Design a binder for this molecule. Structure first.
Ligand SMILES: [Mn+2]
Ligand SMILES: [Mn+2]
Length: 315
């Protein structure tokens, strides 16, 4: 995401002070995180006996239970990967590049079929099927998830803004740009201590509005304008913002500047979800995790029993 780190106020928070909170988890961010940090001794991804990567399933299961043991009730938010994904103020132009000049012509030679295999992989190790498998696992676990209309980080931010959850869990700071009141990092990966970022604190301390923060983000470069503007960093961008000339500069330097802004200010969201937890299907989890994905039986058994009691007691 946007490298705000060194430039915005934030504070380390203990797992204890996070007890009893509801959180919306940025699903894809979490999955990618598990894939890069949950690996073998040699840095190789976790895999079952068929050679399929199980890194994500491991984090989904154990990380989610770890959170519930500390009275942190999570709701998983996914992007809803399938084709259509228009972020309801997001149809005018792109979402990929299928619109114009995306290189369209006649050609389908040896390299074309060698390229046949040369696509799906683009979807990194985190494949749609793996993502679908993670959702299935959550259902078996009785853990609720939402398939956002488009960007999951936007859906999670909206849920937090509404007060349905206390914060958005993610390793990225981008949720702040969608108005998320709070973001908590380092829960999906615990190398460092949990870190809380309160949007109100960021704005008051830096003396800027959310709209100003988004401008700084645009200067630095968002997923919507990679590379940002002329190598300008946070300091220089913040300088232009405080001077009151940032907006004029961005209109000149960034095509579709207004469109990008609308993505953060007017994302497509949904109210169709539930934070309710359900009892876990112990048998189905064992079959999926142990039988089909070679997880250690003993460990899984112990955890599904603990998960059941947590939800039973929570509920
Ligand atoms: Mn992002
Ligand atoms: Mn995302």
């Amino acid at each position: 995401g946007v490298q705000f780190g060194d430039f915005i106020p934030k504070n380390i928070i203990s797992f204890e002070d996070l007890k009893g909170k509801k959180v919306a988890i940025d699903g894809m961010n979490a999955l990618y995180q598990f894939l890069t940090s949950i690996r073998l001794r040699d840095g190789s991804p976790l895999r079952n006996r068929k050679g399929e990567i199980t890194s994500a399933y491991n984090g989904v299961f154990y990380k989610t239970i770890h959170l519930l043991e500390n009275d942190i009730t999570p709701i998983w938010v996914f992007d809803g990967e399938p084709p259509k994904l228009k972020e309801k103020t997001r149809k005018v132009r792109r979402e990929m590049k299928e619109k114009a000049e995306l290189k369209m012509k006649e050609a389908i030679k040896k390299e074309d079929f060698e390229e046949a295999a040369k696509y799906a992989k683009r979807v990194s190790y985190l494949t749609p099927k793996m993502v679908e498998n993670c959702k299935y696992l959550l259902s078996l676990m009785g853990i609720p998830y939402v398939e956002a209309p488009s960007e999951g980080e936007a859906q999670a931010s909206y849920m937090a803004k509404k007060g349905d959850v206390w914060a958005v869990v993610s390793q990225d700071y981008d949720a702040l740009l969608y108005g998320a009141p709070r973001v908590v990092r380092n829960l999906t990966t615990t190398k460092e201590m949990p870190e809380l970022i309160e949007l109100n604190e960021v704005l008051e301390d830096l003396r800027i509005s959310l709209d100003d923060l988004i401008d700084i983000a645009i200067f630095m470069g968002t997923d919507y304008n990679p590379g940002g503007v002329k190598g300008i960093g946070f300091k220089r961008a913040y300088e232009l913002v405080r001077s009151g000339v940032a907006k004029d500069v961005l209109k000149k330097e960034v095509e579709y500047y207004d469109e990008i802004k609308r993505i953060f200010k007017e994302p497509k969201v949904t109210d169709n979800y539930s934070l309710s937890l359900k009892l876990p299907d112990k048998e189905g989890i064992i079959k999926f995790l142990v039988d089909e994905n070679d997880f250690n039986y003993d460990r899984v058994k112990k955890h599904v029993d603990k998960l059941y009691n947590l939800i039973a007691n929570k509920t």
